Design a protein around this ligand. Structure first.
Ligand SMILES: Nc1ncnc2c1ncn2[C@@H]1O[C@H](COP(=O)(O)OP(=O)(O)OP(O)(O)=S)[C@@H](O)[C@H]1O
Ligand SMILES: Nc1ncnc2c1ncn2[C@@H]1O[C@H](COP(=O)(O)OP(=O)(O)OP(O)(O)=S)[C@@H](O)[C@H]1O
Ligand SMILES: Nc1ncnc2c1ncn2[C@@H]1O[C@H](COP(=O)(O)OP(=O)(O)OP(O)(O)=S)[C@@H](O)[C@H]1O
Ligand SMILES: Nc1ncnc2c1ncn2[C@@H]1O[C@H](COP(=O)(O)OP(=O)(O)OP(O)(O)=S)[C@@H](O)[C@H]1O
Ligand SMILES: Nc1ncnc2c1ncn2[C@@H]1O[C@H](COP(=O)(O)OP(=O)(O)OP(O)(O)=S)[C@@H](O)[C@H]1O
Ligand SMILES: Nc1ncnc2c1ncn2[C@@H]1O[C@H](COP(=O)(O)OP(=O)(O)OP(O)(O)=S)[C@@H](O)[C@H]1O
Lengths: 24, 689, 66, 132, 66, 66
């Protein structure tokens, strides 16, 4: 008789940047 | 019972006294005793900004329980601290976390309000030990949290609280917000008295109490970084350890030991002598120093053992206050306390006689030394080499800066108030605006202050302000606000101060920026705080900021004669009033005026450049002398009112190095001939004789 | 509906405006900085409103708020 | 707070200063209070690598901590890359290395030696305030 | 510090420069400290086969190092 | 301290100034295409200095330099 385990399955997000772009 | 198997009993180790005396807090421990003593939701969680003694407050609760200083309903309780890693640890199989957790909760049911469960770092628990086939460790407790079938005591830092708990506001509102304040100066004083007792129990040494309040004042002033009381406790512990290591070995004994083993090796190499006699004498001196050191160590050891016996008597009378034997109280008091205290003080004054190469106390010099090696702000008290080097201030300016007496004076004054303690704890140490025509020291004094104060030229945070003609250009000195581009690496500046917070900051060429760049400096020169985008503050009350322009250059060339310095300063003040904003220069300590150079200055300058020239040609492998007439030619070459000293520099460069290196990579010059720079008829010859 | 009492101060500086507010803070709370002293030269440009309110969601400025 | 961490611009031999400390211990040139001590280097990667099961990383780490309790203040443990232990076992809804060690260092009970790079200090630690 | 890196704008065949190094090793045009070495290539992506579980990546890398 | 030469040439049109500096490079670097030929007359209004420095952080050219 064999039992189970529990796994990680881990990773991160994906990010953004954002850029002002000045007028004058 | 897995309550044994997965907890810490605080109450035992409090009764075992492995914990710390907790002072103040009676409002806050009161309010915790309140929030435990409810019907639903007996769960306070300590929101505490980091290090203000959150674990200390839960410990102080448990120590009052073992004392029984509480309301009656908490008398006889238990408090069990929870290792989450113990709850996670064996759960290699699926589900085992949940078994351990439910078993501990059912045993908490089976102990029936006796055990007040404790959790530190409650932001760990929200989503603890989970995977896809899990119960995620928030879901398992939340009904018991709502109905108060549990007495969870929480303790987490504010930042983790926001980030990690209130990503589910239900499992926020199950708990109760208990705010810890900032402990003040005097709070810190009291808490340090208690743990002063505790740290002398550890570290075998003696502490002056005005040194303690000095440590509190300095730590509140000079570390922007943790919070109280933890930084002043840090100062106490590190100064005690420095005392301990200065007890553990002596420096003059180390130097004399190197001396005697050198003399021993020399004598053994010799085998008239008299080196044998010198070795015997130095070994006798070292032995005398050693035996004194050992005897005063033994004196310290006896003093500390009887201090420990005093502490054990305090332990016994607290045990008698817990248990309640009656004549034992007055017996132990009147026996143990006053005679051991008076011969503790007799050994203390015997040390205060005898301590020679040899420290036993914690005074303010030790705290200052640990601070000034902990950050680098020079607060520690002077060695006289340092103090006369501060009195060799202006001479060592004139080894870089000829003339220029006004700013020599003012900058000497500023650094004197820097070390003197008379500085404002609200401004940076000196605000400085510098005026003069181009090239008479406005970079040079600042490189000289680096070369004097820090003893290196190019370590001065030189935010050259040429670039800043556009109102973009604040964000390359105070970073970029979040989600934009330069969030994760800050500004150039706030690094370059919060690294090394005693450092001269040049703003070279102030007037050629945008006109209002400089309201950043309104923050600076008022109050020394300057918060960049990423949240963080910067203190400026341990640096020196110097600004250079050339505004009154027409007026300086105009009226350098025929006026006093007062109307000169006034009239160029009117000039800067035409140019700068009236908010700004009111924040300035002194506007000086550089005065234009005369010819003996130029001669001195040319001499210094020849000195570094001879240095450059030294590693080349060449020595050179000059005609003094050739120097007089260069005096005739390198004068003009309109430009100052740079035409001398390039004139020297041409008229010397072009014939010189011309002859050099003519393949001519054997080293060794010290080259007279005697003159040509209008040029200067480099000769081989 | 409103805060307690808002103020704009005027006059040429160094006549005790910032120091008056710090004296209020020394009174009411017993610190200079335990108060929110944000000089506005951090805020000369359009974009740095996110230094005070913060980043909208889904970025890097999502873990230190405002 | 028994734990220094070495900060510089990187290169300047912080690992070297730890080893030279270790030699002066071995030479018996340190002052007496840490003579006879052990200095051992901690791997992150030896701890992490097998633990693809739930919780096994925490058990490896706690067994090491209880070994360090068993040696009872004789071993000066060393961690290079302190900013690596910040997110070391920082798994999905699990415990990292940090939020196990955060009690286990501010009780004096261990003597870890830190060696970080100042830009990674700003990256990974003065974000994460408690460990700082 | 035995590890130098190759640099430029691409389309210059630095891959082939490593190849020609290995060919000279085959031919023995090298100094007497590299005769008999093993020039082996490895992708970082070659060990991103199973990147969910914890340490799996790192166990691959440590097994490589051992 | 100072960079090595610093030269403000004066002369009328086509007297070889550009070709002087190219001959310098073609001596020194065996080409003309090893020189930094920043063509300066693009700059007739001020605020293209960010072409040469870079753009300050929190504007567009932060990842790229000038
Ligand atoms: N009232 C107090 N009595 C005794 N020690 C105190 C008191 N306040 C603070 N301390 C000391 O300050 C430190 C507080 O330790 P902790 O409470 O663990 O720090 P913290 O406030 O919990 O922040 P964290 O969660 O531990 S990062 C310990 O050194 C305590 O001895
Ligand atoms: N008192 C002095 N002693 C020695 N050299 C000096 C002195 N004053 C100026 N110099 C020379 O001045 C040169 C640089 O002039 P700077 O002071 O940099 O010009 P400035 O005064 O800063 O005004 P700017 O910044 O050039 S517009 C250096 O190479 C120094 O050798
Ligand atoms: N009534 C006052 N009591 C005490 N100090 C005062 C008073 N008026 C002015 N000061 C001083 O003048 C300065 C006032 O500081 P601040 O309040 O910052 O100046 P301000 O009036 O706020 O205008 P700015 O924006 O700072 S120029 C400080 O150096 C105070 O010491
Ligand atoms: N004070 C020193 N005395 C002798 N060798 C040193 C010294 N400082 C550095 N080194 C040597 O210079 C190199 C520095 O290596 P590291 O110790 O890795 O430097 P590092 O600062 O740790 O680099 P990082 O930051 O870990 S990537 C090693 O070869 C050291 O032996
Ligand atoms: N000396 C050479 N002899 C023969 N082929 C060469 C030589 N140098 C370059 N090449 C070829 O040039 C091709 C492309 O150059 P690469 O070195 O592959 O480009 P790269 O700059 O290395 O970037 P990648 O990732 O390798 S495409 C190589 O695959 C070779 O086939
Ligand atoms: N002494 C010279 N030797 C070689 N070519 C020369 C000489 N004098 C002029 N030239 C030529 O003159 C031209 C100069 O090109 P450029 O230097 O670009 O013009 P320019 O010198 O920039 O003049 P301006 O003032 O910018 S229009 C080239 O075609 C050169 O070949």
């Amino acid at each position: 008789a064999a039992a189970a385990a529990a796994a990680a399955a881990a990773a991160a997000a994906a990010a953004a940047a954002a850029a002002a772009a000045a007028a004058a | 019972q897995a309550l044994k198997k997965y907890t810490i009993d605080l109450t035992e180790r409090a009764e075992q006294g492995k914990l710390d005396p907790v002072i103040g807090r009676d409002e806050e421990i009161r309010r915790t005793i309140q929030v435990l003593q409810r019907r639903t939701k007996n769960n306070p969680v300590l929101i505490g900004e980091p290090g203000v003694g959150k674990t200390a407050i839960v410990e102080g609760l448990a120590q009052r329980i073992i004392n029984g200083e509480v309301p009656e309903g908490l008398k006889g309780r238990r408090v069990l601290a929870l290792d989450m890693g113990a709850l996670v640890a064996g759960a290699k199989y699926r589900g085992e976390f949940e078994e351990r957790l439910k078993g501990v909760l059912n045993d908490l049911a089976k102990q029936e309000g006796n055990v007040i469960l404790f959790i530190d770092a409650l932001h760990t628990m929200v989503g603890a030990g989970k995977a896809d086939g899990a119960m995620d460790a928030g879901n398992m407790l939340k009904p018991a949290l709502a109905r108060g079938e549990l007495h969870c005591v929480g303790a987490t830092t504010l930042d983790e609280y926001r980030q990690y708990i209130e990503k589910d506001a239900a499992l926020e509102r199950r708990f109760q917000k208990v705010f810890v304040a900032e402990p003040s100066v005097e709070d810190t004083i009291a808490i340090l008295r208690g743990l002063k007792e505790r740290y002398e129990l550890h570290h075998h040494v003696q502490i002056t109490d005005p040194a303690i309040v000095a440590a509190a004042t300095l730590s509140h002033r000079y570390i922007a970084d943790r919070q109280l009381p933890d930084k002043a406790i840090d100062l106490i512990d590190e100064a005690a350890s420095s005392i301990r290591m200065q007890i553990d070995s002596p420096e003059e004994l180390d130097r004399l030991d190197r001396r005697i083993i050198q003399l021993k090796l020399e004598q053994q190499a010799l085998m008239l002598d008299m080196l044998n006699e010198e070795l015997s004498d130095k070994e006798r001196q070292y032995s005398e120093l050693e035996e004194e050191w050992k005897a005063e160590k033994a004196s310290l050891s006896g003093t500390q053992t009887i201090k420990a016996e005093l502490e054990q008597a305090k332990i016994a009378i607290e045990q008698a206050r817990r248990v309640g034997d009656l004549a034992r109280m007055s017996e132990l008091q009147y026996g143990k306390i006053p005679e051991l205290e008076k011969q503790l003080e007799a050994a203390t004054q015997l040390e205060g006689k005898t301590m020679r190469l040899l420290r036993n106390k914690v005074t303010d010099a030790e705290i200052a030394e640990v601070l000034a090696r902990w950050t680098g702000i020079p607060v520690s008290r002077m060695m006289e080499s340092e103090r006369e080097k501060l009195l060799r201030m202006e001479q060592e300016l004139h080894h870089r800066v000829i003339g220029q007496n006004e700013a020599v004076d003012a900058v000497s004054n500023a650094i004197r108030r820097s070390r003197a303690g008379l500085a404002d704890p609200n401004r940076p140490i000196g605000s400085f605006l510098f005026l003069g025509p181009t090239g008479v020291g406005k970079t040079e004094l600042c490189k000289a202050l680096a070369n004097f104060m820090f003893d290196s030229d190019e370590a001065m945070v030189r935010i050259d302000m040429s670039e800043f003609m556009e109102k973009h250009s604040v964000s390359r000195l105070v970073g970029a606000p979040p989600g934009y581009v330069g969030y994760e690496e800050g500004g150039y500046l706030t690094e370059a101060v919060r690294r090394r917070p005693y450092s001269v900051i040049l703003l070279d060429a102030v007037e050629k920026a945008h006109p209002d760049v400089f309201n950043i400096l309104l923050q600076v020169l008022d109050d020394g705080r300057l918060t960049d985008g990423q949240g963080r503050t910067v203190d400026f009350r341990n640096t020196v900021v110097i600004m250079t322009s050339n505004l009154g250059s027409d007026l300086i060339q105009e009226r350098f004669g025929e006026l006093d310095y007062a109307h000169m300063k006034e009239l160029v003040l009117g000039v800067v009033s035409h140019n700068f904003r009236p908010e700004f220069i009111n924040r300035i300590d002194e506007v000086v005026v550089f005065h234009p150079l005369g010819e003996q200055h130029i001669a001195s300058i040319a001499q210094i450049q020849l000195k570094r020239l001879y240095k450059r040609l030294e590693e080349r492998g060449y020595e050179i002398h000059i005609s003094d007439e050739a120097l007089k030619l260069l005096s005739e070459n390198g004068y003009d009112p309109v430009y100052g000293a740079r035409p001398l520099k390039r004139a020297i460069q041409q008229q010397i190095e072009n014939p010189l290196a011309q002859q050099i990579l003519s393949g001519e010059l054997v080293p060794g001939k010290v080259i007279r720079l005697e003159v040509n008829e209008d040029r200067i010859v480099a000769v081989q004789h």
